Design an enzyme around this catalytic site. Sequence first.
Site, short mmCIF file in Angstrom:
data_model
loop_
_atom_site.label_atom_id
_atom_site.label_comp_id
_atom_site.label_asym_id
_atom_site.label_seq_id
_atom_site.Cartn_x
_atom_site.Cartn_y
_atom_site.Cartn_z
CD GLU A 4 -2.72 1.28 3.61
OE1 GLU A 4 -3.48 1.06 2.64
OE2 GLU A 4 -2.07 0.39 4.19
CB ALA B 31 1.03 -2.76 -3.96
CB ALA C 140 8.10 6.40 1.46
CD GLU D 141 11.81 -2.88 1.49
OE1 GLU D 141 12.83 -3.48 1.89
OE2 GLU D 141 10.73 -3.45 1.24
CD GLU E 9 -9.94 1.70 -30.20
OE1 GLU E 9 -8.96 1.34 -30.90
OE2 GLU E 9 -10.97 1.01 -30.04
CG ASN F 299 -0.48 -9.70 -5.63
OD1 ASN F 299 -1.33 -8.88 -5.26
ND2 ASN F 299 0.73 -9.73 -5.10
CG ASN G 34 -5.83 -4.85 -1.77
OD1 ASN G 34 -5.67 -5.33 -2.90
ND2 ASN G 34 -4.80 -4.51 -0.99
N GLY H 186 6.89 0.50 -5.75
CA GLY H 186 6.61 0.04 -4.39
C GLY H 186 6.25 -1.43 -4.32
N1 LIG Z 1 -3.13 -6.53 -3.82
C1 LIG Z 1 -1.99 -6.26 -3.18
N2 LIG Z 1 -1.94 -5.23 -2.33
C2 LIG Z 1 -0.71 -5.05 -1.80
C3 LIG Z 1 0.42 -5.80 -2.02
N3 LIG Z 1 1.47 -5.33 -1.24
C4 LIG Z 1 0.96 -4.32 -0.58
N4 LIG Z 1 -0.36 -4.09 -0.88
C5 LIG Z 1 -1.20 -2.98 -0.38
O1 LIG Z 1 -0.49 -1.77 -0.56
C6 LIG Z 1 -0.69 -0.90 0.58
C7 LIG Z 1 0.63 -0.64 1.27
O2 LIG Z 1 1.54 -0.13 0.27
P1 LIG Z 1 2.85 -0.90 -0.19
O3 LIG Z 1 2.82 -1.01 -1.66
O4 LIG Z 1 3.09 -2.12 0.61
O5 LIG Z 1 3.96 0.20 0.18
P2 LIG Z 1 5.16 0.83 -0.67
O6 LIG Z 1 4.67 1.37 -1.95
O7 LIG Z 1 6.26 -0.15 -0.69
O8 LIG Z 1 5.53 2.04 0.31
P3 LIG Z 1 6.42 2.16 1.68
O9 LIG Z 1 6.70 0.76 2.18
O10 LIG Z 1 5.63 2.98 2.68
O11 LIG Z 1 7.66 2.86 1.19
C8 LIG Z 1 -1.72 -1.59 1.46
O12 LIG Z 1 -3.05 -1.13 1.19
C9 LIG Z 1 -1.52 -3.07 1.11
O13 LIG Z 1 -2.67 -3.86 1.41
C10 LIG Z 1 0.36 -6.89 -2.93
O14 LIG Z 1 1.30 -7.59 -3.30
N5 LIG Z 1 -0.91 -7.05 -3.46
MG LIG Z 2 7.46 -0.79 0.97
#
Ligand SMILES: Nc1nc2c(ncn2[C@@H]2O[C@H](COP(=O)(O)OP(=O)(O)OP(=O)(O)O)[C@@H](O)[C@H]2O)c(=O)[nH]1
Ligand SMILES: [Mg+2]
Lengths: 437, 155, 426
Positions: free
Chosen positions: A183, A12, A99, A71, A254, A228, A206, A10
């Site tokens: 979430e 993140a 999703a 995506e 470990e 990040n 976060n 995904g």
């Molecule tokens: N630290 C951090 N959090 C992120 C980042 N991108 C998204 N998030 C967090 O991730 C959550 C949203 O999930 P995403 O990872 O964007 O979604 P995904 O896994 O692509 O899922 P869908 O788009 O629903 O298919 C939120 O709580 C965001 O704040 C990132 O690059 N860094």
């Molecule tokens: Mg996404």
Amino acid sequence: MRECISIHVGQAGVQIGNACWELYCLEHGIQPDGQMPSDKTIGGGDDSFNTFFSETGAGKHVPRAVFVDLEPTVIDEVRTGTYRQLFHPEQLITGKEDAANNYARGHYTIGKEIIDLVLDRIRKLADQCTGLQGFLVFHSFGGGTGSGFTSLLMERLSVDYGKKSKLEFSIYPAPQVSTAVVEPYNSILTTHTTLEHSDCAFMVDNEAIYDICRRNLDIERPTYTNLNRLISQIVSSITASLRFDGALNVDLTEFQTNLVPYPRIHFPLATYAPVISAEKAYHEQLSVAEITNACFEPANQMVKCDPRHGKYMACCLLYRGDVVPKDVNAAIATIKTKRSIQFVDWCPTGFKVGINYQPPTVVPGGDLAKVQRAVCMLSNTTAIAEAWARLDHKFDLMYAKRAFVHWYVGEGMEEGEFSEAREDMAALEKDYEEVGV
Amino acid sequence: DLGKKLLEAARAGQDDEVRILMANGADVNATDASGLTPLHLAATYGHLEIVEVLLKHGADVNAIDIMGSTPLHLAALIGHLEIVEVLLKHGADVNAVDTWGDTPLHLAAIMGHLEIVEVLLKHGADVNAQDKFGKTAFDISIDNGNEDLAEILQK
Amino acid sequence: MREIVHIQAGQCGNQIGAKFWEVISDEHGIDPTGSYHGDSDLQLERINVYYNEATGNKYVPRAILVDLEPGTMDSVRSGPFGQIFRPDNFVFGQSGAGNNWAKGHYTEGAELVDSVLDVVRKESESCDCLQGFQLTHSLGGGTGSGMGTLLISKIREEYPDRIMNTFSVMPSPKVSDTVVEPYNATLSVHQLVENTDETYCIDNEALYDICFRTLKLTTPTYGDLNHLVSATMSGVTTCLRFPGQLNADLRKLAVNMVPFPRLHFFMPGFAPLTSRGSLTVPELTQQMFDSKNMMAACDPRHGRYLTVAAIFRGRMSMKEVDEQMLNVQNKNSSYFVEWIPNNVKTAVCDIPPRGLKMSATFIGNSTAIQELFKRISEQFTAMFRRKAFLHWYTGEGMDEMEFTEAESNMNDLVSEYQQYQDATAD
Ligand SMILES: Nc1nc2c(ncn2[C@@H]2O[C@H](COP(=O)(O)OP(=O)(O)OP(=O)(O)O)[C@@H](O)[C@H]2O)c(=O)[nH]1
Ligand SMILES: [Mg+2]
Ligand SMILES: Nc1nc2c(ncn2[C@@H]2O[C@H](COP(=O)(O)OP(=O)(O)O)[C@@H](O)[C@H]2O)c(=O)[nH]1
Ligand SMILES: COc1ccc(/N=N/c2cc(OC)c(OC)c(OC)c2)cc1O
Ligand SMILES: [Ca+2]
């Protein structure tokens, strides 16, 4: 030398993965094209860095990693970025439709269209290993892919790789930079179904990282780039023992023996110090005692919680840089009576210490100043149950009215799964209470 | 039976046929299965010329159907201003109450017929008349948020 | 994902639909010919969402035009952006609907529905990954209301996993003095509750009140009411058309805005309100939560917000928007449901619409929308109790029970809003 494969799921997981691999290349001296002038053995080797990087034949050092997203937008930035020539192109996997912040879509309907391809590509990396020890899985709790796809992937990896370890780097949601109202649901559903299949998981709040960027780095409105870059610094400190010579947390097994006393309470707290703004380039260098004291301050933690409210089961300190062992031991002696640290009666009150004498690397363009010494403390404390309680309370407020539940039911999921996931979280909070909090 | 032919002619706006049927003994106060008379149908479908001709030939201006509706109720509900004026000129009861407690004022207020609301008030419509649920025309204007109607009723 | 197929049905549907394309084409730098004349690459990054690339590097809207009267076809073609529509996507009938829902849903409309479905299939097969459909129509007429709702149900049958979004114009005696409009709107709402995922409720009562009381226009015209409609449609679709932070799509909007399946009727809003010829960040946040800036004639302070999405457009401080949104949330805390945490989402877009340097667009799922439904329900019951003009619908094959079933469903929808307005979390 025992190999580790990293899987980024995904937005993140992919974005944090891209920041981590950029930092790993700078620490090992790997150029963006994969060349490593310091590697004298061309074509292979049993060196510590080979746990994370394979070698092709023409001296190319390739990450043992797979990026997956439902995506293509985010993975397309990795395909056109600075390190576009570093990864295997077949290890960057994308679907056409995400999703939609829905765990059920990621796990049951959309995620099922690409799970077999992902496992076949992971198998190709696994076949290239002589002694695979396990997987490091990066993902959000809140996203539909990060929550739903990761749980499906972890279930399948347990069947196909029974005796292998699985570690997680999970992004816990914060309202300041969140993307969806559901979430809390996605976070509880993925925690319930992944709990059996994960041996150790490092949660990254976060809100905690957002606050550190504001307070220490003077960033008024932190973006995902700022968050990040700091998270990659902490992830590197945790994985440095798997990529360099050392005597603490040298393999994935470990990590479990040192930090996980019982299978279900496998969520250690990470604390990192010092975090100094890059505009303070001539800052006074902090001593071993000062940075070790900073590990017991709640403001430097990766998860917002108060360790004075709980008890410790394990505590590992991993230093980087100009650190004399006797200065560490003197600091451990002072941080035994001056501060209120209580261990559980059934564990030795000792602190495990590991020292890597190279200072941390800073990335060009980052927000951090160069430091002569740094420390990452990993501790299993019962105070981390406060993070679970905050999340369970948000789940209960919406689930009492069954708000948004129809979106999950409409994607091949039973309503009963919500109550069984919540029941498991009730038992998990109770497991921490039984130890002591 | 010319009574049924006069009811159809009044609804369809067949002015010439209304004249021919009345001249041949048709019952001007004929009723259909629900109690509606040619004057009720003329007032509902907006046939002003038929309304005037029927009233000059013995139509009961205050006739009621099985639900207590008068021709004035139906002209005020559908929004036929000129018919409402002709009916009131011929002695229509401005405060007639149907089986739901509604008066013509209530129906013109609900349907947003502001000019008909003004005409009814100038002919003595009771601003305190409540329907079966206790509501006056002013209560309807406050509950629905109709500022223009509320201003007209405050005159 | 990306592609949206747009459908505009009936007189109102085509008039507001054509204005939507004129306003967004100017924003994206597309002239009536179809050539690109913009001075920014941000105008072309998500063009695929609403346009198809034609030969010679020209952009043709993914729009289908439909009506049972040919006169509407001529009025759209003779407009400024009338030649850009694909001539194959103009599906027009011979006899109109005559403000009759039954003609649109069961007789005139049912005979032309298969021909529209053929061009829908053609546009859908040309999509890389179709996300959903958007329909523009009124609920008080016959074609937009009757044929529009029939076309929704058939599209739902062939595409059950795609999002169905509508821009539905609600009737008012202040704009159109036709007493059968509450019948046509009530029958349409019965269909929308079951077959759409998200509906923007654009109320002609609210549009007339804004023009007459706020903009001081003594005799508002349809062009004046449509000036506010086009500004609202531009504002609510901004994120779908530009990059920004949100990875915009209709399914994520639905999952986050719709907590209960039937409660999917949104109250849109816009700030500033302006005329066809004639602000700070705290001033925009204040106007967005004011009853005079809502496109639905309902007082938000009479109910509670379940979910809210705000879109700020223009060059402005990100921290200032975060601070001003927080202030309006604390002062108006009793108007937000406490059982859906973090129920207000903020979006920012650098490209503002033409004429305005900064604007804000509000999308609220509020229980106060029940006042709009009660207004239509009262007018429906006043007419239906006297069975006035019922033969115009039963004569086209409609059963009397369909009026009572639509009436019962609308009262149950109002009851459902009141249930969640009175709920408490503790
Ligand atoms: N630290 C951090 N959090 C992120 C980042 N991108 C998204 N998030 C967090 O991730 C959550 C949203 O999930 P995403 O990872 O964007 O979604 P995904 O896994 O692509 O899922 P869908 O788009 O629903 O298919 C939120 O709580 C965001 O704040 C990132 O690059 N860094
Ligand atoms: Mg996404
Ligand atoms: N805001 C707005 N309302 C319109 C417009 N055209 C018609 N209406 C409204 O639409 C309703 C009549 O529906 P109409 O679209 O003419 O009928 P159809 O052709 O059978 O769909 C009435 O409530 C009108 O006030 C327009 O361009 N703008
Ligand atoms: C209750 O909390 C929430 C409310 C709304 C939220 N999202 N809102 C949008 C709005 C959009 O444009 C209107 C999108 O573009 C179509 C969009 O695509 C992603 C999302 C998010 C929330 O966490
Ligand atoms: Ca080598």
